[PDB]
Amino acid sequence: EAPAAVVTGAAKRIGRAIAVKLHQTGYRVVIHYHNSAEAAVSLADELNKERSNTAVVCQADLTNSNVLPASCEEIINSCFRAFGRCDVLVNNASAFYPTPLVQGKTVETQVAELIGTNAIAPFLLTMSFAQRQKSNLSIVNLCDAMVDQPCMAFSLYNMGKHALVGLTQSAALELAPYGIRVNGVAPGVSLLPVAMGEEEKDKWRRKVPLGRREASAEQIADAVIFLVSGSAQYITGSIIKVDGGLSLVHA
Amino acid sequence: EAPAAVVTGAAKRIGRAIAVKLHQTGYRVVIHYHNSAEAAVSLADELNKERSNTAVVCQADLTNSNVLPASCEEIINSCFRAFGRCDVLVNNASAFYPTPLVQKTVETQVAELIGTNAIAPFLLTMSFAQRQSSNLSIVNLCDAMVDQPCMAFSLYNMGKHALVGLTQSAALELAPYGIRVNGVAPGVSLLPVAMGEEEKDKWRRKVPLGRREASAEQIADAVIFLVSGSAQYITGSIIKVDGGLSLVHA
Amino acid sequence: MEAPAAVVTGAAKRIGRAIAVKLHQTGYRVVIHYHNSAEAAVSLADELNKERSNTAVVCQADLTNSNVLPASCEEIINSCFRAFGRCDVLVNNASAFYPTPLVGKTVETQVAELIGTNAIAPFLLTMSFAQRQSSNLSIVNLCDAMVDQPCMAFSLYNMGKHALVGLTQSAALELAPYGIRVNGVAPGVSLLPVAMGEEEKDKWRRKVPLGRREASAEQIADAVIFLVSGSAQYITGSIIKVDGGLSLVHA
Amino acid sequence: EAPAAVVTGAAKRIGRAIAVKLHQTGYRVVIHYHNSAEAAVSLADELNKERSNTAVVCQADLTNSNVLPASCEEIINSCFRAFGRCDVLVNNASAFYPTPLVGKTVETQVAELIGTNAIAPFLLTMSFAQRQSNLSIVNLCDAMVDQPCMAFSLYNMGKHALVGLTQSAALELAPYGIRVNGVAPGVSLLPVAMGEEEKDKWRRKVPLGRREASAEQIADAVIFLVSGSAQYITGSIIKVDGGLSLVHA
Ligand SMILES: NC(=O)c1ccc[n+]([C@@H]2O[C@H](COP(=O)([O-])OP(=O)(O)OC[C@H]3O[C@@H](n4cnc5c(N)ncnc54)[C@H](OP(=O)(O)O)[C@@H]3O)[C@@H](O)[C@H]2O)c1
Ligand SMILES: NC(=O)c1ccc[n+]([C@@H]2O[C@H](COP(=O)([O-])OP(=O)(O)OC[C@H]3O[C@@H](n4cnc5c(N)ncnc54)[C@H](OP(=O)(O)O)[C@@H]3O)[C@@H](O)[C@H]2O)c1
Ligand SMILES: NC(=O)c1ccc[n+]([C@@H]2O[C@H](COP(=O)([O-])OP(=O)(O)OC[C@H]3O[C@@H](n4cnc5c(N)ncnc54)[C@H](OP(=O)(O)O)[C@@H]3O)[C@@H](O)[C@H]2O)c1
Ligand SMILES: NC(=O)c1ccc[n+]([C@@H]2O[C@H](COP(=O)([O-])OP(=O)(O)OC[C@H]3O[C@@H](n4cnc5c(N)ncnc54)[C@H](OP(=O)(O)O)[C@@H]3O)[C@@H](O)[C@H]2O)c1
Ligand SMILES: N#Cc1ccc(COc2ccc3nc(N)sc3c2)cc1
Ligand SMILES: N#Cc1ccc(COc2ccc3nc(N)sc3c2)cc1
Ligand SMILES: N#Cc1ccc(COc2ccc3nc(N)sc3c2)cc1
Ligand SMILES: N#Cc1ccc(COc2ccc3nc(N)sc3c2)cc1
């Protein structure tokens, strides 16, 4: 039988790219989404049209709350209900916005969203993935190559991505005896925010030593693909930067 | 006249050592506590006998909840009330226990481990900075074993990693205000009181420098260094005080 | 002549051999550099030339730091151009590894050997490779996942490996404008020293979370193959730990 | 009774400020120098005036060669000759200049940059440790080591190796009671050769005060690491960079 993978925030962008690429590699996929109903279903359609019964959608808010554990438990349940297995979990879903330290959302909403999506939901999804296990099991977390050179006023987001590095190492150590590898893919600049203007986009592009451009979503997916593959069978607790040398450029 | 410092979880162990050493260096201090009122008051009394009206206590739960921002705002407010200023914030308070991935509700554990170790320090940081010549700085109590974590301590580990991220981000963001932001990262200092004595010796014997844990005062020394005029260009730095423990391979 | 060409240093045995083999299996013509192991280097070349004619040469050079090291490194790179008309890939694999405690070989020889092979020779090879430059040009340095938790009394080895991390980062930055990518593979415990007793080998094996075993040479080679591939074309300045979680294990 | 310290490249700039501050703290100092003879003897005068018999100079070229071990051995020897002890070693001496991947031979470039920045520190560390209370070594590392300057590969390689040494020697020498630590400046006293527009360019990058570190600010970290207040600190590198290493492209 074909292996099965969960991709969080899979409706668009990097998540979609990962889902698609895992699909073309022969995975059945759970397209998790939050607000992107249209894009999620539309992607699952495209995928099923290619090989029938290979894609499902799973809606979940991944903001931290007392129900997040059940929501994460359910996401993994959705893989097992659809496919009888869960071989790969990609923690791709991410909230990303400034939270300036010196002063819309309450700060507790901000904490719930930025730490929730970026770290707490991956932790809970990992617990659920690991516990539901009865092959090549792995977890890939979408980290950030710029964690130690953070953007001004993104403290909560930065905190969550650091926590995610924390989890990747802690989970790799813990889940290694169960044969579950846990690794990271750290984009520098990939697909820029939809909201971002071209002039600003180019400001970021010009910083990238390797070709003065952002990563395509497929280039990110490539590293994900490598990590879940048999070519990475001994790789655990490793974070592969996919950043064109961005994190190496001094101020 | 004298600078003032907040130390969270300052009733016992490392926070106590930090509070004392700060006071010995001439700081007025807020001794924050959650459960340890008796110990907190005892410390304040001891320091006030040395210098009158130089130590105050302040109760707060630093677990993450909808009231944590108010609590943290109050911790900082209590320093400005007592002393008319807040020059130092030491984020020492920390919940610490294992949270296995394969098995208190996990969300309590989250609120406690991430709350104390990362969220409350972020909010305290905010309130500290909002309320602002001077030598303003923040010291965050990190963990030197963060990249070699203990088995089944994922949430603790995530919270400390988050604290490393806050150190860095706040150092950048607050540098234009002259607020320095730094970390001290113990390896093995005072062991958890609940831990078995043999389990303590195992940890002690692993330390390259003297096969013993750091005393609390040794941790406090790094903190004292970081808040001083001797560290006025230092921001975004985390100083390991671990006797080389983080350098020892499996 | 449309086939790409790779230089692998210390390619005669163990990890570099597996890398030469895997590169060859990928469609690379290979320069098999060696120092002492002439017989093994030639028999690799022969085995590879049996598979495809005129796709493997050998190149002898001592990689010890000396006045002639720069000429030697230039020759190694030239040899690839003379054999195959191109040089697409450099794999800095060769390494001396022995203790140099702080408290028949002189310390200066120890320096020349451990720093020469592990750092200087990679720097000069890098320089010659770049000076000489559809194309996908990259360098892969064989680092060490344990550089921040070093073995007792291996300071010079450790120092050369750390220097290699520096080169990887510095060369990635410098060579990104030429479209030369520069990455590391960092093994933990891989193919253990040839004579080392199985009781002692098991002490290292038991430390690894993922399977309580060392990496095969082929597993290290897998990460090298990924880094040189079309799948890694935005990856530069990255070091991929291939260590089975070994770096994550506390004392 | 008074402890003794070796500082390499102590005639000028950061080395000088380390020597000055160690002296003020109560150390006898060996002022190692290579070319800066006048400034070295001049510093030892200033120090010796202040407390006689507390400063010597020691000349050595710290470029890698077959004789570098004997020169490093000599530098430590000259501390024991003058003062009967050697409590502190400060690895400050550094070559620093571009070596692009694409006036000196590359073999000289290697010998200088890897010699001064890494090999001489290793050899000095060896000799220091061989001759053996609060014993320690401080290495002058670099906070920009993972965000290197363009075309400084050899220099960066040496500072990377220095981190390696700091860690490996900290581990190895800890059972002897010798601690080994690093101080990593970002932008401190900018190279003399550099023009003033370029200096200001670098100044503007520093989040904390938009200025370089004084040599005294760097020396303060060295002072802390050698002091009683750092007795459990080994294998730590303290960035003294005003938050520069935190600034993205
Ligand atoms: N793009 C880059 O340049 C870049 C750079 C560095 C790191 N990364 C990392 O790479 C990963 C993918 O990047 P990306 O730009 O493709 O991500 P993105 O488009 O900004 O967001 C990914 C998806 O996460 C889901 N999400 C957001 N908030 C959520 C919440 N509260 N609950 C549940 N789901 C939520 C969204 O799903 P719906 O659309 O269904 O609501 C969203 O489409 C992320 O983890 C990111 O942090 C990306
Ligand atoms: N001890 C070590 O070896 C070691 C190693 C690595 C890192 N560290 C770091 O060093 C720092 C201090 O260490 P320590 O051993 O002194 O830690 P500890 O005794 O375990 O710290 C607990 C202190 O923080 C307060 N605290 C705990 N949970 C809290 C909550 N939910 N809300 C509010 N306050 C809470 C406590 O206050 P009350 O008693 O008043 O309730 C207590 O005084 C910590 O940040 C720790 O992570 C220590
Ligand atoms: N194996 C592991 O467990 C492990 C762990 C961490 C890192 N690594 C890294 O992975 C790489 C390959 O590992 P390995 O175990 O296969 O390495 P290795 O067997 O120790 O050495 C590989 C080759 O390096 C060459 N070499 C040694 N000294 C030399 C000199 N002075 N001049 C020129 N060549 C010299 C030798 O060539 P000849 O035999 O032809 O003389 C040797 O066969 C190394 O860079 C190593 O540091 C390996
Ligand atoms: N300045 C900064 O902004 C900065 C930033 C990051 C790191 N650092 C590090 O901090 C330390 C001190 O900085 P600095 O600017 O004061 O250093 P520097 O002035 O550039 O050099 C210090 C001394 O090193 C000695 N030296 C150079 N080549 C030598 C050789 N071949 N043999 C023996 N000695 C040699 C010279 O001594 P003589 O004059 O006696 O010949 C020189 O005065 C260095 O390790 C440096 O890499 C400095
Ligand atoms: N303002 C602003 C700004 C600054 C830097 C970036 C870099 O691109 C990123 C970085 C992280 C990140 N995380 C997501 N979930 S999307 C994204 C884009 C994007 C936006
Ligand atoms: N099991 C286990 C175990 C392993 C290592 C340690 C080291 O000591 C620490 C570490 C973190 C920490 N955080 C606190 N709030 S107390 C404490 C003690 C303590 C317990
Ligand atoms: N003492 C000791 C000791 C430490 C680590 C290992 C793991 O195997 C390695 C590590 C690095 C290394 N470098 C080479 N050129 S071979 C090799 C084997 C083997 C022995
Ligand atoms: N080109 C160029 C250039 C870029 C940045 C700097 C920063 O200042 C430093 C850094 C390292 C260093 N090492 C020395 N031995 S002096 C020195 C000055 C100095 C020069």
D236: contact with C, CB 8 A cutoff: no
Across B170-207, b (16+ Cβ under 10 Å) vs e yields bbbbbbeebbbbbbbbbbbbbbeeeeeeeeeeebeebb
Closest C-alpha to ligand 5, atom 12? A96
CA of A164, nearest ligand number: 1
What is the distance in angstroms between the Cα of B84 and the nearest Cα belonging to chain D? Answer: 25
From CA D135, how far away is CA D126, in angstroms rounded?
14
D145: contact with A, CB 8 A cutoff: no
Does the annotation mark C157 as catalytic?
yes
Instruction: State which ligand 8 atom lies nearest to the alpha carbon of D13.
Output: 16
Fill in the amino acid letter for B221: D
Q: Looking at chain C, which residue has its C-alpha nearest residue A169?
A: C248
The CA-atom distances, in angstroms, between D76 and each of A171, D5, D115 are: 48, 9, 17
B209: contact with C, CB 8 A cutoff: no
Does the annotation mark B97 as catalytic?
no
- Pocket lining for ligand 8, CB < 6 angstroms: D 94, 96, 142, 149, 187, 190-191, 202
Question: Which runs of consecutive H residues, i.e. helices, occur in chain B?
Answer: 13-24, 37-50, 68-83, 106-114, 120-130, 154-174, 197-206, 216-227
Q: Is B77 annotated as contributing to ligand binding?
A: no
Residue among B174, B127, B169, B125 nearest A155 (CA):
B169
Q: Are the C-beta atoms of residues A191 and A197 closer than 8 Å to each other? A: no
Within 6-45 of A, beta carbons closer than 8 Å to B belong to: none
CB-nearest partner of D230 from B180, B221, B246: B221
Q: Is B7 helix (H, G, I), strand (E, B) or coil?
A: strand
Across B7-38, b (16+ Cβ under 10 Å) vs e yields bbbbbbbbbbbbbbbbbebebbbbbbbbebee
Q: Are the C-beta atoms of residues B217 and D224 closer than 8 Å to each other? A: no
For chain A, give the residues followed by a break (C–N over 2.5 Å): 103, 134
From CA D28, how far away is CA D25, in angstroms rounded?
9
Query: Domains in chain B, please, with CATH?
Result: 1-250 (3.40.50.720)
Distance D211 CA to ligand 8 centre (A): 14
Task: Identify all chain C residues contacting D110, using CB atoms and an 8 Å cutoff.
Answer: 65, 120, 123
The CA-atom distances, in angstroms, between D33 and each of D12, D42, D159 are: 9, 12, 20
Q: Going edge to edge, which strands form the sheet with B136-141? A: B55-59, B28-33, B4-7, B88-91, B136-141, B179-186, B238-241
Q: How long is chain A?
A: 251
From CA B143, how far away is CA B132, in angstroms rounded?
28
Q: Looking at chain C, which residue has its C-alpha nearest residue B207?
A: C251
Q: Going edge to edge, which strands form the sheet with D88-91? A: D55-59, D28-33, D4-7, D88-91, D136-140, D179-185, D237-240
Beta-bridge partner residues of C232: none
CB-nearest partner of A119 from B64, B107, B158: B158
Task: Identify all chain B residues contacting C146, using CB atoms and an 8 Å cutoff.
Answer: 249
Going D143 to D147 to D149 to D152, the CA torsion angle's sign is: positive
> What are the structure tokens assigned to A190, written together?
């990939």
From CA C57, how far away is CA D147, in angstroms rounded?
38
From CA B222, how far away is CA B241, in angstroms rounded?
8
Q: Is D25 annotated as contributing to ligand binding?
A: no
A163: contact with B, CB 8 A cutoff: yes
- D142, D176, D220, D241: the catalytic one is D142
Q: Is A241 annotated as contributing to ligand binding?
A: no
Task: Identify all chain D residues contacting B244, using CB atoms and an 8 Å cutoff.
Answer: 170-171, 174, 234-235
**Per-residue DSSP letters for C1-13?**
--S-EEEETTTTS
CA of A68, nearest ligand number: 1
Beta-carbon separation of C210 and A247 below 8 A: no
To 10 degrees, what angle do helices D120-130 and D153-173 make? 20
Distance B58 CA to ligand 2 centre (A): 16
> What are the structure tokens assigned to C233, written together?
């074309």
Q: Are the C-beta atoms of residues A93 and A9 closer than 8 Å to each other? A: yes
Kindly calculate the radius of gyration of chain A based on its CA atoms and give it in whole angstroms. 17
B177: contact with A, CB 8 A cutoff: yes
Q: Is A62 annotated as contributing to ligand binding?
A: yes
A101: contact with D, CB 8 A cutoff: no
Hey, how many other C-beta atoms are within 10 angstroms of the C-beta on B67? Answer: 13
Backbone angles phi, psi at B31, to 5 degrees: -95, 95
Beta-carbon separation of D229 and B232 below 8 A: no
D144: contact with A, CB 8 A cutoff: yes
Going A18 to A21 to A27 to A31, the CA torsion angle's sign is: positive
Task: Identify all chain B residues contacting C247, using CB atoms and an 8 Å cutoff.
Answer: 147-148
With the most atoms of ligand 5 within 8 angstroms of its CB, the residue from A35, A90, A192, A242 to mutate is A192
**Residue C229: which H helix or E strand, with range?**
none
The CA-atom distances, in angstroms, between D85 and each of C206, D54, D104, D130 are: 44, 12, 38, 12
Q: Is B62 helix (H, G, I), strand (E, B) or coil?
A: coil
- C28, C34, C88, C157: the catalytic one is C157
Kindly calculate the radius of gyration of chain C based on its CA atoms and give it in whole angstroms. 17
Closest C-alpha to ligand 3, atom 13? C15
B232: contact with D, CB 8 A cutoff: yes
Kindly calculate the radius of gyration of chain D based on its CA atoms and give it in whole angstroms. 17
- B143, B201, B221, B242: the catalytic one is B143
What is the distance in angstroms between the Cα of B106 and the nearest Cα belonging to chain A? Answer: 8
Beta-carbon separation of C231 and A223 below 8 A: yes
> How far from the centroid of its chain's Cα atoms is residue C100's Cα?
21
3-state class percentages of chain C: helix first, strand second, coil last, to nearest 5: 45, 15, 40
Q: Are the C-beta atoms of residues C30 and C5 closer than 8 Å to each other? A: yes
The CA-atom distances, in angstroms, between D203 and each of A251, D94, D185, D187 are: 11, 21, 13, 8
